[PDB]
Amino acid sequence: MIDDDGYRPNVGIVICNRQGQVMWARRFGQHSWQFPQGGINPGESAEQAMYRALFEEVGLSRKDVRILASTRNWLRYKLPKRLVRWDTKPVCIGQKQKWFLLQLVSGDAEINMQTSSTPEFDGWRWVSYWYPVRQVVSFKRDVYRRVMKEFASVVMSLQENTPK
Numbered sequence: 001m002i003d004d005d006g007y008r009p010n011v012g013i014v015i016c017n018r019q020g021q022v023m024w025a026r027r028f029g030q031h032s033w034q035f036p037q038g039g040i041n042p043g044e045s046a047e048q049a050m051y052r053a054l055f056e057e058v059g060l061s062r063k064d065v066r067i068l069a070s071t072r073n074w075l076r077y078k079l080p081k082r083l084v085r086w087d088t089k090p091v092c093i094g095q096k097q098k099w100f101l102l103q104l105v106s107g108d109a110e111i112n113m114q115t116s117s118t119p120e121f122d123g124w125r126w127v128s129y130w131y132p133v134r135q136v137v138s139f140k141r142d143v144y145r146r147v148m149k150e151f152a153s154v155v156m157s158l159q160e161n162t163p164k
Contacts, residue, residue: 001039001040001041001042002088002089002090002092003096005090005093006090006091006092006093006094007076007092007093007094007095007096008039008088008092008094008095008096009039009040009049009074009096009097010037010038010039010040010053010095010096010097010098011037011038011040011046011049011050011052011053011097011098011099011100012035012036012037012038012053012097012098012099012100012147013036013038013050013053013054013057013058013065013099013100013102014036014099014100014101014102014147014151015036015058015065015102015104016068016101016102016103016104016151016155017104017107017126018103018104018158019126019159020129020155020156020158020159021126021127021128021129022126022127022128022129022131022132022148022155023036023058023124023126023132024124024125024126024127024131024132024135025057025058025113025120025121025122025123025124025125026121026122026123026124027120027121027122028113028118028119028120028121028122029122033132033135034120034121035132035136035140035144036053036057036058037053037095037097038052038053038054038056038057039053040052046098047067047100050098050100054102055115055116056115056116056119056120057113057119057120057121058111058112058113058121059111059112059113059114059115059116059119060106060110060111060112063105063106064104064105064106064110065102065103065104065105065106066102066103066105067100067101067102067103068101068102068103068151068154068155069100069101069150069151069154070098070099070100070101071097071098071099071100071146071147071150072150073098074096074097074098075096075097075098075099075143075146075147076094076095076096076097076143077094077095077139077140077142077143078093078094078139079092079093079094079095079139080139099147099150099151101151101154101155103158108124111124129148129152129155129156130145130148132144132148133145133148
């Protein structure tokens with residue numbers, strides 16, 4: 001499944017841990033960090049696929065989290081040449097992604113990340129807001145910034161309401 005022009009449809013989970021901090025997790029088998037993103041399953045709508053990725057990536061289900069916001073339209077960006085697949089047909093030249101801001105309702109104790117038998121994450125750490133934007137590769141950084149900007153005040157209001 002590719003969206004018409006060569007874009008893979010995905011959903012990115014922005015877990016926000018209610019201390020004012022964001023999703024970041026060490027990537028299984030790679031031993032370095034990675035962003036979230038999970039493909040959309042054919043004919044599964046964005047919210048349904050978002051709970052699919054929530055399970056595949058974080059090992060959480062349709063109950064462990066609370067949607068607060070989502071990106072106003074599908075963000076997308078273009079893979080660098082060497083990371084373009086050439087094996088997908090159509091050739092996949094980018095990630096079409098809608099990010100969902102999820103407030104954590106369960107947590108670390110209920111997060112399992114190894115639900116999928118070959119997941120992407122091995123374990124994590126809630127980190128300062130803009131930190132993952134610096135950790136990600138330079139071509140993604142700009143786009144991930146937009147995701148963070150779209151949600152910044154939505155997370156910060158919870159750490160900015162008493163004291164706040």
